[PDB]
Amino acid sequence: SPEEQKQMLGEAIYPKVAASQPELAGKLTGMILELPVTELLHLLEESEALDAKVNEALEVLKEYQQN
């Protein structure tokens, strides 16, 4: 299913996210998993693309939880 597709890609993305955000990795990975599979495969191939997506999700999350 698409859900297991995302979950499987999440399994590869999570440790890369956790290496820079060990506390928020679960939440940041889940946010990123909204993206389509082709984009997720791109993030797994390009560490600087994943990093920028992590930073974006960080800023979206902070705005959500602050103001």
């Binding site: 979950q7 999570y14 939440k27 889940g30 946010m31 974006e56 705005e63």
Partner: peptide
Amino acid sequence: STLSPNASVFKPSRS
């Protein structure tokens, strides 16, 4: 953004 702060926390599986 396209990212939602309402997204589910990702949980890894284990054996």
